[PDB]
Amino acid sequence: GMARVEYSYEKLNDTHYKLKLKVTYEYRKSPEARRLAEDLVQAFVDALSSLPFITVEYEVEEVEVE
Amino acid sequence: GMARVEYSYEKLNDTHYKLKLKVTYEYRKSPEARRLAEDLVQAFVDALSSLPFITVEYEVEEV
Protein backbone atom coordinates (compact mmCIF):
# COMPACT_ATOMS: atom_id res chain seq x y z
CA GLY A 1 0.00 0.00 0.00
CA MET A 2 1.22 3.44 1.04
CA ALA A 3 2.31 4.93 4.36
CA ARG A 4 3.16 8.33 5.82
CA VAL A 5 4.73 9.45 9.10
CA GLU A 6 4.72 13.11 10.12
CA TYR A 7 5.74 14.33 13.55
CA SER A 8 5.70 17.12 16.09
CA TYR A 9 8.43 17.54 18.70
CA GLU A 10 9.09 19.92 21.58
CA LYS A 11 12.28 20.79 23.48
CA LEU A 12 12.12 22.40 26.92
CA ASN A 13 14.93 23.28 29.30
CA ASP A 14 16.62 20.22 30.85
CA THR A 15 13.72 18.11 29.52
CA HIS A 16 14.41 15.40 26.97
CA TYR A 17 12.73 15.83 23.60
CA LYS A 18 9.03 14.99 23.47
CA LEU A 19 7.99 13.41 20.17
CA LYS A 20 4.54 12.74 18.70
CA LEU A 21 4.27 10.58 15.58
CA LYS A 22 1.21 10.51 13.31
CA VAL A 23 1.22 7.19 11.45
CA THR A 24 -1.16 6.91 8.48
CA TYR A 25 -1.22 3.92 6.14
CA GLU A 26 -3.53 2.19 3.68
CA TYR A 27 -3.77 -1.60 3.48
CA ARG A 28 -5.73 -1.75 0.19
CA LYS A 29 -8.40 -4.02 1.70
CA SER A 30 -5.85 -6.82 2.18
CA PRO A 31 -6.12 -8.73 5.49
CA GLU A 32 -2.46 -9.78 5.42
CA ALA A 33 -1.37 -6.17 4.87
CA ARG A 34 -3.60 -5.00 7.73
CA ARG A 35 -2.20 -7.64 10.09
CA LEU A 36 1.35 -6.88 8.94
CA ALA A 37 0.87 -3.11 9.21
CA GLU A 38 -0.49 -3.37 12.75
CA ASP A 39 2.31 -5.75 13.78
CA LEU A 40 5.01 -3.56 12.22
CA VAL A 41 3.69 -0.25 13.56
CA GLN A 42 3.39 -1.84 17.00
CA ALA A 43 6.94 -3.17 16.66
CA PHE A 44 8.17 0.34 15.84
CA VAL A 45 6.12 1.62 18.79
CA ASP A 46 7.85 -0.73 21.23
CA ALA A 47 11.26 0.21 19.83
CA LEU A 48 10.77 3.98 20.06
CA SER A 49 8.98 4.04 23.42
CA SER A 50 11.83 2.05 24.99
CA LEU A 51 14.22 4.91 24.18
CA PRO A 52 14.64 6.59 27.60
CA PHE A 53 16.07 9.95 26.44
CA ILE A 54 12.94 10.84 24.43
CA THR A 55 9.21 10.80 25.14
CA VAL A 56 7.13 9.30 22.32
CA GLU A 57 3.39 9.69 21.70
CA TYR A 58 1.46 7.94 18.94
CA GLU A 59 -1.52 8.36 16.63
CA VAL A 60 -2.21 5.57 14.12
CA GLU A 61 -4.71 6.02 11.28
CA GLU A 62 -5.83 3.06 9.17
CA VAL A 63 -7.24 3.60 5.67
CA GLU A 64 -9.04 0.90 3.70
CA VAL A 65 -8.07 2.19 0.23
CA GLU A 66 -6.67 5.29 -1.48
CA GLY B 1 1.97 -11.46 8.86
CA MET B 2 4.11 -11.00 11.96
CA ALA B 3 6.83 -8.35 12.15
CA ARG B 4 9.65 -7.62 14.58
CA VAL B 5 11.82 -4.55 15.20
CA GLU B 6 15.02 -5.07 17.17
CA TYR B 7 16.81 -1.95 18.33
CA SER B 8 19.88 -0.55 20.07
CA TYR B 9 21.38 2.90 20.58
CA GLU B 10 24.36 4.81 21.94
CA LYS B 11 24.92 8.32 23.25
CA LEU B 12 26.61 10.86 20.97
CA ASN B 13 25.68 13.93 23.02
CA ASP B 14 23.02 14.51 25.66
CA THR B 15 20.74 15.58 22.78
CA HIS B 16 22.09 13.79 19.69
CA TYR B 17 21.65 10.01 19.63
CA LYS B 18 22.40 7.11 17.28
CA LEU B 19 19.52 4.66 16.82
CA LYS B 20 20.07 1.21 15.29
CA LEU B 21 17.15 -0.84 14.00
CA LYS B 22 16.67 -4.30 12.50
CA VAL B 23 13.26 -4.95 10.93
CA THR B 24 12.11 -8.47 10.06
CA TYR B 25 8.74 -9.28 8.52
CA GLU B 26 6.78 -11.76 6.44
CA TYR B 27 4.11 -10.91 3.86
CA ARG B 28 2.21 -14.24 3.76
CA LYS B 29 2.11 -14.40 -0.06
CA SER B 30 0.44 -10.96 -0.14
CA PRO B 31 1.99 -8.41 -2.54
CA GLU B 32 0.09 -5.62 -0.77
CA ALA B 33 1.51 -6.59 2.62
CA ARG B 34 5.07 -6.70 1.27
CA ARG B 35 4.97 -3.20 -0.25
CA LEU B 36 3.10 -1.85 2.78
CA ALA B 37 5.76 -3.25 5.10
CA GLU B 38 8.45 -1.55 3.01
CA ASP B 39 6.61 1.77 2.71
CA LEU B 40 6.01 1.76 6.48
CA VAL B 41 9.72 1.12 7.08
CA GLN B 42 10.71 3.89 4.67
CA ALA B 43 8.25 6.29 6.32
CA PHE B 44 9.49 5.66 9.87
CA VAL B 45 13.13 5.85 8.75
CA ASP B 46 12.77 9.08 6.77
CA ALA B 47 10.87 10.65 9.67
CA LEU B 48 13.36 9.58 12.34
CA SER B 49 16.39 10.47 10.21
CA SER B 50 14.97 13.96 9.60
CA LEU B 51 14.98 14.58 13.36
CA PRO B 52 18.16 16.60 14.09
CA PHE B 53 18.58 14.80 17.43
CA ILE B 54 18.57 11.31 15.85
CA THR B 55 20.76 9.49 13.35
CA VAL B 56 19.31 6.21 12.07
CA GLU B 57 21.10 3.07 10.93
CA TYR B 58 18.87 0.17 9.96
CA GLU B 59 18.55 -3.05 8.00
CA VAL B 60 15.49 -4.93 6.75
CA GLU B 61 15.23 -8.72 6.45
CA GLU B 62 12.46 -10.80 4.91
CA VAL B 63 11.44 -14.19 6.29
Numbering used by the authors:
A (entry chain A): 3 to 68
B (entry chain B): 3 to 65
Sentences from the paper on this structure:
Here we use deep network hallucination to generate a wide range of symmetric protein homo-oligomers given only a specification of the number of protomers and the protomer length. Starting from only a choice of chain length L and oligomer valency N (2 for a dimer, 3 for a trimer, etc.), the method carries out a Monte Carlo search in sequence space starting from a random sequence. The loss function guiding the search is computed by inputting N copies of the sequence into the AlphaFold2 (AF2) network, and combining structure prediction confidence metrics (pLDDT; per-residue structural accuracy, and pTM; an estimate of the TM-score) with a measure of cyclic symmetry (the standard deviation of the distances between the center of mass of adjacent protomers within the predicted structure). To eliminate such over-fitting, we generated new sequences for the HAL backbones using the recently developed ProteinMPNN sequence design neural network (accompanying manuscript: Dauparas et al.).
To evaluate design accuracy we attempted crystallization of 19 designs and succeeded in solving crystal structures for seven (three C2s, two C3s and two C4s). All crystal structures had the correct oligomerization state and closely matched the design models (median Cα RMSD of 0.6 Å across all designs, with resolutions ranging from 1.8 to 3.4 Å). The side chain conformations in the crystal structures also closely match those of the design models. HALC2_062 is a three-layer homo-dimer with a single helix from each protomer packed together between two outer β-sheets (one from each protomer), while HALC2_065 is also a mixed α/β homo-dimer, but has a single, continuous β-sheet shared between both chains, which wraps around two perpendicular paired helices. These two hallucinated structures are distinct from any structure in the PDB, with TM-scores to their best matches of 0.59 and 0.54 respectively.
